[PDB]
Structures are given as structure tokens and as C-alpha cells.
């Protein structure tokens, strides 16, 4: 197995996947690495199994259909994986914890949002449809763009939203378009 966390790229107290060479900090994996379970398979491996069991699941889908899906176990897992893919980028640090807003010429957002809040909401089964998770994720970046205005720091929101959207299209097999 790897000797660094797949998510944050640091060593430490690492749990190793039994079916692939990846490794994880306990709270870097989503869901948090399970207490017992021998063998243990990571979220990457669990996602690959869903695909392998239903090869047709990779055919193109419309985003509007995907958003309306109820959060049954497979969709829960897909949203956990998509969240984890965002944490895998180091620029997610800016969006992880609760923000505050005190900048001359700007007013904070009406509905603040951050990655650790989405993580808690998934763990608590607070989303009933994919749409609830996707709307909170996109709100993170939209709040950032609106608040930072013409500051070049706005670009961080565009960057991490692009990681989110590429992974969304991949994980939920969104129909490719020009």
C-alpha cells in the first residue's frame, strides 16, 4: 500500500485498503474509516464495484434526472465520493471550515456554506435527493465569487468548482456535450 493519505498526501496513522493500494487517514476517508471490517474496501473500490455490477450505469445521463434521484445507498455513496474528490485538491482548504465575511465594499452571503458542513449533512442523512447535496456544493463556490468580486482570490472558487463539476460529470456519468 501507499505510505501517504490519498486525500491530504501526508503520512500518519493510515488505514490501508484491502483491494487497492490506497491508504487513508481515518477522517480523510468519507465515510470515516469503519471500526472493524476485515477485509476493508475504500470508497474508490466500492464505487468501482457499483460500476462493475451494472456496466450500463456508465451510459450518459441527463443532469436533471440525476439531481432528482432519491438518496438511496448507491447515490449516498456517489455523493460521499464526489465530496472526497473535492477534498483531494489542496485548494479545498479554503472552503473546508466555516467562513466569515468582513471586507470593505462587500456583504457576506445570506446562506454561508462550507465543505465540513456538507460532510456533516451527509453523515447525518440530511439530504433526501442528489439535488440537495449538489445545490449546497455549488453554493460554496457561488458565495465565494460573489463576495470576492474583482479580487483575484475569486479564482480559487472557479478552480475548485471546476474540480467539483468534472468529478460530478464522471461519477454520475453525465452525457458528454460540446
**Where does this chain bind Zn ion (CB under 5 A)?**
5, 7-8, 17, 20, 25, 28, 42, 44-45, 54
HSE on the CB side for 156, CA within 13 Å? 16
CB of 82 to Zn ion, least distance (A): 17
Rounded-to-integer distance, Cα 168 and Cα 155, Å: 20
Cα 119 to chain centroid distance, Å, stands at 8
Rounded-to-integer distance, Cα 81 and Cα 130, Å: 13
Residue 66 or residue 134: which is nearer to Zn ion going by CB? 66
CB of 145 to Zn ion, least distance (A): 28
From the CB of residue 25, how many other CB atoms can be counted at a distance below 10 Å? 19
CB of 14 to Zn ion, least distance (A): 8
Residue 2 or residue 76: which is nearer to Zn ion going by CB? 2
Residue 45 or residue 139: which is nearer to Zn ion going by CB? 45
Question: In sequence order, what are the beta bridge partners of 70?
Answer: 129
Rounded-to-integer distance, Cα 147 and Cα 52, Å: 43
Continuous segment of H or E residues that includes residue 24: strand 23-25
* CB-closest chain residue to Zn ion: 5
Rounded-to-integer distance, Cα 33 and Cα 67, Å: 27
Residue 95 or residue 127: which is nearer to Zn ion going by CB? 95
CB of 41 to Zn ion, least distance (A): 6
CB of 27 to Zn ion, least distance (A): 8
Residue 88 or residue 174: which is nearer to Zn ion going by CB? 88
Amino acid at each position: 500500500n501507499s505510505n501517504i493519505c490519498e486525500v491530504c498526501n501526508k503520512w500518519g496513522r493510515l488505514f490501508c485498503c484491502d483491494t487497492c493500494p490506497r491508504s487513508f487517514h481515518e477522517h480523510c476517508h468519507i465515510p470515516s474509516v469503519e471500526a472493524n471490517k476485515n477485509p476493508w474496501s475504500c470508497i474508490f473500490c466500492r464505487i468501482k464495484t457499483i460500476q462493475e455490477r451494472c456496466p450500463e450505469s456508465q451510459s450518459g445521463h441527463q443532469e436533471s434526472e440525476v439531481l432528482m434521484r432519491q438518496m438511496l445507498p448507491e447515490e449516498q455513496l456517489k455523493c460521499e465520493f464526489l465530496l472526497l474528490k473535492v477534498y483531494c485538491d489542496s485548494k479545498s482548504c479554503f472552503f473546508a471550515s466555516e467562513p466569515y465575511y468582513n471586507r470593505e465594499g462587500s456583504q457576506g452571503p445570506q446562506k454561508p456554506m462550507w465543505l465540513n458542513k456538507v460532510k456533516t449533512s451527509l453523515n447525518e442523512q440530511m439530504y433526501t435527493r442528489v439535488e440537495g447535496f449538489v445545490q449546497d456544493m455549488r453554493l460554496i463556490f457561488h458565495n465565494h465569487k460573489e463576495f470576492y468580486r474583482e479580487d483575484k482570490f475569486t479564482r480559487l472558487g472557479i478552480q475548485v468548482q471546476d474540480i467539483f463539476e468534472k468529478n460530478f460529470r464522471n461519477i454520475f456519468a453525465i452525457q458528454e456535450t460540446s
